Scaffold this active site. Structure first.
Site, PDB file in Angstrom:
ATOM      1  N   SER A  18       0.812  -1.213   0.000  1.00  0.00           N
ATOM      2  CA  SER A  18       0.000   0.000   0.000  1.00  0.00           C
ATOM      3  C   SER A  18       0.848   1.267   0.000  1.00  0.00           C
ATOM      4  O   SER A  18       0.300   2.369   0.118  1.00  0.00           O
ATOM      5  CB  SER A  18      -0.942   0.009   1.210  1.00  0.00           C
ATOM      6  OG  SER A  18      -0.215   0.078   2.426  1.00  0.00           O
ATOM      7  N   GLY A  19       2.164   1.145  -0.131  1.00  0.00           N
ATOM      8  CA  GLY A  19       3.001   2.280  -0.464  1.00  0.00           C
ATOM      9  C   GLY A  19       2.720   2.893  -1.818  1.00  0.00           C
ATOM     10  O   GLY A  19       1.776   2.500  -2.509  1.00  0.00           O
ATOM     11  N   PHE A  20       3.546   3.868  -2.196  1.00  0.00           N
ATOM     12  CA  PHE A  20       3.369   4.649  -3.415  1.00  0.00           C
ATOM     13  C   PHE A  20       2.753   3.866  -4.568  1.00  0.00           C
ATOM     14  O   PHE A  20       1.664   4.206  -5.025  1.00  0.00           O
ATOM     15  CB  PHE A  20       4.704   5.229  -3.851  1.00  0.00           C
ATOM     16  CG  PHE A  20       5.234   6.254  -2.912  1.00  0.00           C
ATOM     17  CD1 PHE A  20       4.691   7.526  -2.869  1.00  0.00           C
ATOM     18  CD2 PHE A  20       6.276   5.943  -2.064  1.00  0.00           C
ATOM     19  CE1 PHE A  20       5.185   8.467  -1.992  1.00  0.00           C
ATOM     20  CE2 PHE A  20       6.778   6.880  -1.189  1.00  0.00           C
ATOM     21  CZ  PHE A  20       6.236   8.142  -1.149  1.00  0.00           C
ATOM     22  N   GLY A  21       3.460   2.859  -5.081  1.00  0.00           N
ATOM     23  CA  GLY A  21       3.017   2.189  -6.297  1.00  0.00           C
ATOM     24  C   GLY A  21       1.613   1.623  -6.185  1.00  0.00           C
ATOM     25  O   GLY A  21       0.748   1.875  -7.033  1.00  0.00           O
ATOM     26  N   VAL A  85       1.260 -10.980   3.047  1.00  0.00           N
ATOM     27  CA  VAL A  85       1.208 -11.988   1.992  1.00  0.00           C
ATOM     28  C   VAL A  85       2.237 -13.072   2.279  1.00  0.00           C
ATOM     29  O   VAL A  85       3.445 -12.816   2.305  1.00  0.00           O
ATOM     30  CB  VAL A  85       1.453 -11.342   0.622  1.00  0.00           C
ATOM     31  CG1 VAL A  85       1.420 -12.383  -0.484  1.00  0.00           C
ATOM     32  CG2 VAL A  85       0.401 -10.283   0.346  1.00  0.00           C
ATOM     33  N   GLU A 180      20.866  12.058   5.746  1.00  0.00           N
ATOM     34  CA  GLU A 180      19.755  12.592   6.529  1.00  0.00           C
ATOM     35  C   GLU A 180      19.913  12.304   8.018  1.00  0.00           C
ATOM     36  O   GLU A 180      19.791  13.210   8.855  1.00  0.00           O
ATOM     37  CB  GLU A 180      18.447  11.990   6.024  1.00  0.00           C
TER      38      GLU A 180
HETATM   39  C1  LIG Z   1      14.512   6.507   4.973  1.00  0.00           C
HETATM   40  C2  LIG Z   1      14.116   6.538   3.522  1.00  0.00           C
HETATM   41  C3  LIG Z   1      14.039   7.734   2.857  1.00  0.00           C
HETATM   42  C4  LIG Z   1      13.671   7.793   1.506  1.00  0.00           C
HETATM   43  N1  LIG Z   1      13.608   9.016   0.902  1.00  0.00           N
HETATM   44  C5  LIG Z   1      13.256   9.044  -0.351  1.00  0.00           C
HETATM   45  C6  LIG Z   1      13.175  10.276  -0.990  1.00  0.00           C
HETATM   46  O1  LIG Z   1      13.426  11.321  -0.417  1.00  0.00           O
HETATM   47  N2  LIG Z   1      12.798  10.295  -2.305  1.00  0.00           N
HETATM   48  C7  LIG Z   1      12.514   9.163  -2.979  1.00  0.00           C
HETATM   49  O2  LIG Z   1      12.186   9.280  -4.156  1.00  0.00           O
HETATM   50  N3  LIG Z   1      12.587   7.954  -2.404  1.00  0.00           N
HETATM   51  C8  LIG Z   1      12.937   7.890  -1.142  1.00  0.00           C
HETATM   52  N4  LIG Z   1      13.016   6.675  -0.508  1.00  0.00           N
HETATM   53  C9  LIG Z   1      12.723   5.439  -1.247  1.00  0.00           C
HETATM   54  C10 LIG Z   1      11.303   5.380  -1.718  1.00  0.00           C
HETATM   55  O3  LIG Z   1      10.455   5.329  -0.600  1.00  0.00           O
HETATM   56  C11 LIG Z   1      11.106   4.114  -2.544  1.00  0.00           C
HETATM   57  O4  LIG Z   1      11.920   4.185  -3.700  1.00  0.00           O
HETATM   58  C12 LIG Z   1       9.660   3.918  -2.979  1.00  0.00           C
HETATM   59  O5  LIG Z   1       8.831   4.712  -2.136  1.00  0.00           O
HETATM   60  C13 LIG Z   1       9.226   2.480  -2.867  1.00  0.00           C
HETATM   61  O6  LIG Z   1       7.857   2.480  -2.421  1.00  0.00           O
HETATM   62  P1  LIG Z   1       6.842   1.464  -3.102  1.00  0.00           P
HETATM   63  O7  LIG Z   1       5.702   2.238  -3.669  1.00  0.00           O
HETATM   64  O8  LIG Z   1       7.634   0.565  -3.979  1.00  0.00           O
HETATM   65  O9  LIG Z   1       6.376   0.669  -1.806  1.00  0.00           O
HETATM   66  P2  LIG Z   1       6.965   0.877  -0.344  1.00  0.00           P
HETATM   67  O10 LIG Z   1       6.511   2.197   0.166  1.00  0.00           O
HETATM   68  O11 LIG Z   1       8.426   0.619  -0.402  1.00  0.00           O
HETATM   69  O12 LIG Z   1       6.248  -0.292   0.473  1.00  0.00           O
HETATM   70  C14 LIG Z   1       5.449  -1.259  -0.242  1.00  0.00           C
HETATM   71  C15 LIG Z   1       4.233  -1.598   0.579  1.00  0.00           C
HETATM   72  O13 LIG Z   1       4.090  -3.038   0.651  1.00  0.00           O
HETATM   73  C16 LIG Z   1       3.878  -3.424   1.984  1.00  0.00           C
HETATM   74  N5  LIG Z   1       4.383  -4.766   2.144  1.00  0.00           N
HETATM   75  C17 LIG Z   1       5.673  -5.144   2.354  1.00  0.00           C
HETATM   76  N6  LIG Z   1       5.812  -6.444   2.457  1.00  0.00           N
HETATM   77  C18 LIG Z   1       4.528  -6.942   2.300  1.00  0.00           C
HETATM   78  C19 LIG Z   1       4.011  -8.245   2.304  1.00  0.00           C
HETATM   79  N7  LIG Z   1       4.753  -9.331   2.476  1.00  0.00           N
HETATM   80  N8  LIG Z   1       2.680  -8.384   2.117  1.00  0.00           N
HETATM   81  C20 LIG Z   1       1.943  -7.283   1.944  1.00  0.00           C
HETATM   82  N9  LIG Z   1       2.322  -6.009   1.922  1.00  0.00           N
HETATM   83  C21 LIG Z   1       3.644  -5.911   2.107  1.00  0.00           C
HETATM   84  C22 LIG Z   1       4.635  -2.389   2.799  1.00  0.00           C
HETATM   85  O14 LIG Z   1       4.182  -2.343   4.131  1.00  0.00           O
HETATM   86  C23 LIG Z   1       4.265  -1.120   2.035  1.00  0.00           C
HETATM   87  O15 LIG Z   1       2.988  -0.651   2.439  1.00  0.00           O
HETATM   88  C24 LIG Z   1      13.382   6.600   0.826  1.00  0.00           C
HETATM   89  C25 LIG Z   1      13.472   5.385   1.516  1.00  0.00           C
HETATM   90  C26 LIG Z   1      13.825   5.346   2.840  1.00  0.00           C
HETATM   91  C27 LIG Z   1      13.911   4.023   3.552  1.00  0.00           C
HETATM   92  O1  LIG Z   2      13.604  16.538  -8.821  1.00  0.00           O
HETATM   93  C1  LIG Z   2      12.600  16.559  -8.097  1.00  0.00           C
HETATM   94  C2  LIG Z   2      12.304  15.321  -7.201  1.00  0.00           C
HETATM   95  S1  LIG Z   2      10.691  14.413  -7.555  1.00  0.00           S
HETATM   96  C3  LIG Z   2       9.961  13.567  -6.092  1.00  0.00           C
HETATM   97  N1  LIG Z   2      10.620  13.610  -4.899  1.00  0.00           N
HETATM   98  C4  LIG Z   2      10.079  12.985  -3.763  1.00  0.00           C
HETATM   99  O2  LIG Z   2      10.746  13.062  -2.712  1.00  0.00           O
HETATM  100  C5  LIG Z   2       8.797  12.289  -3.848  1.00  0.00           C
HETATM  101  C6  LIG Z   2       8.229  11.646  -2.708  1.00  0.00           C
HETATM  102  C7  LIG Z   2       6.999  10.988  -2.839  1.00  0.00           C
HETATM  103  C8  LIG Z   2       6.325  10.968  -4.082  1.00  0.00           C
HETATM  104  C9  LIG Z   2       6.894  11.604  -5.218  1.00  0.00           C
HETATM  105  C10 LIG Z   2       8.159  12.284  -5.088  1.00  0.00           C
HETATM  106  N2  LIG Z   2       8.746  12.926  -6.195  1.00  0.00           N
HETATM  107  N3  LIG Z   2      11.797  17.749  -8.102  1.00  0.00           N
HETATM  108  C11 LIG Z   2      12.013  18.996  -8.930  1.00  0.00           C
HETATM  109  C12 LIG Z   2      11.587  20.270  -8.120  1.00  0.00           C
HETATM  110  C13 LIG Z   2      12.530  20.547  -6.932  1.00  0.00           C
HETATM  111  C14 LIG Z   2      14.009  20.663  -7.368  1.00  0.00           C
HETATM  112  C15 LIG Z   2      14.447  19.431  -8.175  1.00  0.00           C
HETATM  113  C16 LIG Z   2      13.493  19.231  -9.372  1.00  0.00           C
END
Ligand SMILES: Cc1cc2nc3c(=O)[nH]c(=O)nc-3n(C[C@H](O)[C@H](O)[C@H](O)COP(=O)(O)OP(=O)(O)OC[C@H]3O[C@@H](n4cnc5c(N)ncnc54)[C@H](O)[C@@H]3O)c2cc1C
Ligand SMILES: O=C(CSc1nc(=O)c2ccccc2[nH]1)NC1CCCCC1
Ligand SMILES: Cc1cc2nc3c(=O)[nH]c(=O)nc-3n(C[C@H](O)[C@H](O)[C@H](O)COP(=O)(O)OP(=O)(O)OC[C@H]3O[C@@H](n4cnc5c(N)ncnc54)[C@H](O)[C@@H]3O)c2cc1C
Ligand SMILES: O=C(CSc1nc(=O)c2ccccc2[nH]1)NC1CCCCC1
Lengths: 443, 443
Positions: A18-21, A85, A180
Site C-alpha cells: 500500500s506504499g506509493f506504487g 502476503v 539525513e
Molecule cells: C529513509 C528513507 C528515505 C527515503 N527518501 C526518499 C526520498 O526522499 N525520495 C525518494 O524518491 N525515495 C525515497 N526513498 C525510497 C522510496 O520510498 C522508494 O523508492 C519507494 O517509495 C518504494 O515504495 P513502493 O511504492 O515501492 O512501496 P513501499 O513504500 O516501499 O512499500 C510497499 C508496501 O508493501 C507493503 N508490504 C511489504 N511487504 C509486504 C508483504 N509481504 N505483504 C503485503 N504487503 C507488504 C509495505 O508495508 C508497504 O505498504 C526513501 C526510503 C527510505 C527508507
Molecule cells: O527533482 C525533483 C524530485 S521528484 C519527487 N521527490 C520525492 O521526494 C517524492 C516523494 C513521494 C512521491 C513523489 C516524489 N517525487 N523535483 C524537482 C523540483 C525541486 C528541485 C528538483 C526538481
C-alpha cells in the site's frame, strides 16, 4: 480456503502493498470497471521520505502515516485489507496472506505487486540485532528511543569511557537516508539538547558516517557529493569513506578500510542505512515463472513490467529491476500508474495489439543535508544550499495528505528550524527495545 | 554503589516522579538554596487527562507528553535523571534506582515521594494480559492498536459470531476514564469509521460499559450521573451497573449481576479502568516508618504529609491518602507546592516553629461524556452539556506546555469535532501486542 474479501462478478484486481506504487494504481482505478483488493502489511501509507523527521522528533506519526482506509474512503471499487502476503500462486490465481494467525487466499484476475525493498546487511544478517535501519514507523520510533536514551544513560555514568561509548553515534551507509540521519543526529546533539544536560555537554557527541563507497550520494556525482560532504564535515560529522564493516555488536563496530588497517569504533547506537533487499516475494515469483532476480532480488520484469509467461501480473516500484530506473518515489508512482492504465485499457476493450513499453519520465531528485542545506539536480542543472532546501521542503509538503497535516507540519518546521525546540521528543522503553528483546526471548 | 548524580555541598532534595506533584515541587524550588534531583521512570510529563484522546487517535504524544528534561532546562539547580526507583532507605538516606541494568544510590537530605497510583484488578491480576490497563503512553498506543485492529480483523472474518465478538468493545469501570473511553470508542465507531469499511458496518459496533458501582461518576452524585448515563445511552452505549467481573479471557468477560445470576460478555477488546492501586514504594515505607496503608495501599501521611518519625520525607499526590482530598490533579499540585514551600522555608530559615497543616483548596472537577457533552460541579452549581464541554476544553487547553502545542491541539479538536476525520489513526502490531507477546515469552 477463506477468500478474506468481498465476492465479485467483475474483473478482479489484487494489489499487494500500500506504499506509493500500490496506492497510485488503486487511485488510478477509481472509475475503472474492476473490483480492486489492496492487501498490505500495515494500515498506513508511510511517506518514507520524511521518516528521518519522526525518527528525530521533528514530526509526529500521523503527519506521515495516514490510514489507507481514509484515503480510499470514497472509492467504491476498492476494498482495503490488512494482511501479510505469505505466498502467491500464479497457476491457481490466489494470493495467500495471514492476519493474526488466520489464513486468507484471495483470488485475482490480475496483480499489481508493489512490495518494495528494504536495507541489506550483505549476509551479515545477525547485525539486525544491533543496528536497525528504520524504513518503518516501528523502526523509526526504535531509533528515536535509542538516540535519546543514549544521552539519558550518558548523564548517569561516572565512567568516562562509557560516556564516550554512549555519546558516539554511528551511521552506516552514505546514501540519502544516511546523510539525513547523520545530519539530524548532529543537529539534535548540537542544538536541541544544548542546555538540557548538566553532567555532559551534548555538543561533545560524535556522529560518524561510514560507507565503503568512495563518495557520498553516488547517484548525484562528484560536485554535489563533495559539497554535501563538506557541509557534513563543517557540521563536525566525521565522514569516513572506503571503510567496510567486518563485525557489529552491542558495544561497537569494527571496520576494515582499503588499506586493511582493521580498527574498532566503540559506539552504543548504530544505524544501518546501507544496501537494498527486495521483498522475498521475488523468490516465489522466480520459482514459478523462472524470471531472473538481480542481486538484491529485484525482479527482472519484462518491458511491460509483466512476468514472463504470466501477463497482467505486474511488478512495480522498488521490487522491479527496471533498466536504469532509480529506486525513487516517482518510479513507483509511474510504474503503478502505467500498470493501472494498462488494466483499465484492457478491461474497457480498447487494448492495442501490443502494449507500448514503460518509459520512466525522469523528474529529478533531491537530498537534504541539514537545516538550510540540501542538494538537487534537474537534467543538466545542479544547485545546492538554501534555495535547494526550500525546493525540497516545498516538494514534500505538497505531497502530505490533508490540509491540516500540511499546516501542522509547516508549524513544526517553523519552530524546529527557527528555534532550538523539537516536538515529539518522547522515549518509551517498550518501543525502544521490544523488537530486540522479543528476538532474544523467542527461542 | 554509584551516586547516580552530581555531588554537592548544598542541602540535597530528591524528587520521585515526573508527574504533576513532583514536577510542581521541582518548579517551586526554582530559587530555593537547594540542589534538586528528580528521578522518574520516563522522560515525559504525561498529561493524563487527555490520554483517552491519544488512545483514540485525536492527538499525538509529545503534545500530551512534553519532555520533562526540557521543561526544567533553565532551572540551573535541578538535575533530571532517568531511572526506576527500586528501593528507598530511610536510615541510610539513599534512594536506590536502576536504569538498563545499572544501579545507583542517590543520597537525599529531604525527599519528595510523588510516584503515582495506577489501576487495580482487585487481585485478579491475571486479567492484565486480557484487559490492558491505562495510564501510560504505551497503554494508550496499545488500546489504539487493539481498537482499530478489531475492525481490521472484523472485515476479513467470515463467521458472524466472530465479527460480533470482534465488534463488541467492553469498558470496565465507570469512573471518568471509563466514561471517556466508552464515549470516544462509540463516537469513533459511529463517525470516524462510518463508511470506511465494506464487509462490515462500523455503526453496528457494540460498546458496553461495566461497573459494579451503583451509579456512573459516583463522586459527582445522582444529578450529574443520571445525565451522563442518559447521554451515554443516547449514543447507544449499553450501560450496565451492579455487575461485578468474575473472570476475563481473550474471548470475553463473565460477570455476575446483583441478582447473583451469572452471564458472559463475548468481547475481543477489553479496557480496564476500575479501582486504584498505589505504587509499591508505599510498602517499603510501611516496613520502615510503620505508616499505615489504606485498602489501596496509599500512605496515611501525617497532617504535614511527612512519614511518622521521618520529618522532611514527604509522600504526596496520588500515593498519599488524606481524608476528603480526592485523587485528582489539583490535589497533587497543591500537595507538591506545599511540601516544596516547607522545604524552602526550612532551608532559608524564618520557618514557623510548627508547620501549619496542609489544606486542600477544592477547585472543582468535571468529566467529559463525548463531543458537545460534559458534566461539571463547582460548589453548589452543577452545569452540564455544551457549556460544560467548552469549559473542559478551555481548562485543559490552558495547561498544555508551549504555545505551538496548544495551537496544534486546537486545530486537531477543530477538525475532529467539526468533521468526522481523525489525524493520528496510525497503529502497528508491535504497539498493539508487544507486551502481551513478550510476557507470554518471558517464562
Ligand atoms: C529513509 C528513507 C528515505 C527515503 N527518501 C526518499 C526520498 O526522499 N525520495 C525518494 O524518491 N525515495 C525515497 N526513498 C525510497 C522510496 O520510498 C522508494 O523508492 C519507494 O517509495 C518504494 O515504495 P513502493 O511504492 O515501492 O512501496 P513501499 O513504500 O516501499 O512499500 C510497499 C508496501 O508493501 C507493503 N508490504 C511489504 N511487504 C509486504 C508483504 N509481504 N505483504 C503485503 N504487503 C507488504 C509495505 O508495508 C508497504 O505498504 C526513501 C526510503 C527510505 C527508507
Ligand atoms: O527533482 C525533483 C524530485 S521528484 C519527487 N521527490 C520525492 O521526494 C517524492 C516523494 C513521494 C512521491 C513523489 C516524489 N517525487 N523535483 C524537482 C523540483 C525541486 C528541485 C528538483 C526538481
Ligand atoms: C486515565 C486518567 C484520567 C484522568 N483524568 C483526570 C481528570 O479528568 N481530571 C483530573 O484532574 N485528573 C485526572 N487524572 C489525573 C490522575 O487521576 C491523578 O489524579 C494525577 O495525575 C496525579 O498524578 P501525580 O502527580 O500523583 O503523578 P502521576 O502523574 O500519577 O505519576 C507520578 C510519576 O512517577 C513516576 N513513577 C512511577 N513509578 C515510579 C518509580 N517506581 N520510580 C520512579 N518514578 C516512578 C511516573 O512515571 C510519573 O512520572 C487522570 C489520570 C488518568 C490516568
Ligand atoms: O472543576 C474544575 C477542574 S480543575 C483541574 N482539572 C484538571 O483536569 C487539571 C489537570 C492538570 C492540572 C490541573 C487541573 N485542574 N475547575 C473549575 C473551573 C472550570 C469549571 C468547573 C470548575
Amino acid at each position: 480456503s477463506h477468500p478474506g474479501a468481498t465476492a465479485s462478478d467483475r474483473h478482479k484486481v489484487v494489489i499487494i502493498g500500500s506504499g506509493f506504487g500500490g496506492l497510485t494504481a488503486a487511485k488510478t482505478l477509481k472509475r475503472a470497471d474492476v473490483d480492486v483488493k489492496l492487501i498490505a502489511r500495515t494500515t498506513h501509507h508511510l511517506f518514507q521520505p520524511l521518516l528521518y523527521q519522526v525518527a528525530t522528533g521533528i514530526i509526529s506519526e500521523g503527519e506521515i502515516a495516514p490510514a489507507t482506509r481514509v484515503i480510499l474512503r470514497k472509492q467504491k471499487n476498492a476494498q482495503v485489507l490488512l494482511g501479510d502476503v505469505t505466498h502467491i500462486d500464479l497457476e491457481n490465481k490466489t494470493v495467500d496472506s495471514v492476519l493474526l494467525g488466520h489464513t486468507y487466499s484471495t483470488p485475482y484476475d490480475s496483480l499489481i505487486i508493489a512490495a518494495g525493498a528494504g536495507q541489506s546487511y550483505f549476509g551479515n544478517d545477525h547485525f539486525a540485532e544491533f543496528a536497525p535501519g528504520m524504513k518503518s514507523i516501528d523502526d523509526a520510533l526504535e531509533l528515536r528511543g535509542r538516540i535519546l536514551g543514549a544521552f539519558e544513560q550518558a548523564e548517569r555514568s561516572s565512567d568516562p569511557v562509557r560516556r564516550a561509548k554512549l555519546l558516539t553515534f554511528t551511521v552506516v551507509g552514505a546514501g540519502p537516508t544516511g546523510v539525513e540521519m547523520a545530519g539530524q543526529i548532529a543537529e539534535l546533539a548540537d542544538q536541541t539538547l544544548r542546555g538540557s544536560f548538566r553532567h555532559i555537554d551534548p555538543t561533545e557527541a560524535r556522529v560518524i558516517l561510514l560507507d565503503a563507497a568512495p563518495a557520498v550520494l553516488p547517484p548525484m556525482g562528484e560536485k554535489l557529493g563533495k559539497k554535501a560532504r563538506a557541509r557534513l564535515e563543517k557540521m563536525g560529522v566525521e565522514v569516513q569513506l572506503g571503510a567496510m564493516v567486518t563485525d557489529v555488536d552491542r558495544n561497537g563496530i569494527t571496520v576494515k578500510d582499503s588499506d586493511g588497517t582493521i580498527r574498532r569504533i566503540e559506539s552504543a547506537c548504530k544505524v544501518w542505512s546501507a544496501g537494498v533487499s527486495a521483498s522475498p516475494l521475488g523468490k516465489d515469483l522466480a520459482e514459478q515463472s523462472g524470471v531472473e532476480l538481480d542481486r538484491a532480488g529485484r525482479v527482472k520484469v519484462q518491458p511491460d513490467l509483466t512476468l514472463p509467461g504470466h501477463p497482467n501480473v505486474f511488478v512495480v516500484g522498488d521490487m522491479a529491476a527496471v533498466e536504469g530506473v532509480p529506486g525513487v518515489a516517482q518510479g513507483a508512482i509511474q510504474g503503478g500508474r502505467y500498470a493501472a492504465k494498462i488494466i483499465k485499457r484492457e478491461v474497457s476493450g480498447t487494448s492495442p495489439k501490443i502494449r507500448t513499453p514503460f518509459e520512466y519520465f525522469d523528474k529529478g531528485s533531491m537530498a537534504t543535508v541539514s537545516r538550510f542545506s540540501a542538494v538537487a539536480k534537474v537534467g543538466p542543472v545542479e544547485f545546492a544550499g538554501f534555495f535547494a532546501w526550500l525546493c525540497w521542503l516545498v516538494l514534500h509538503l505538497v505531497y502530505l495528505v490533508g490540509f491540516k497535516t500540511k499546516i501542522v507540519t509547516l508549524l513544526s518546521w517553523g519552530v524546529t528550524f527557527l528555534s532550538t525546540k523539537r516536538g515529539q521528543l518522547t522515549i518509551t522503553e517498550q518501543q525502544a527495545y521490544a523488537r530486540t528483546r522479543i528476538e532474544e526471548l523467542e527461542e
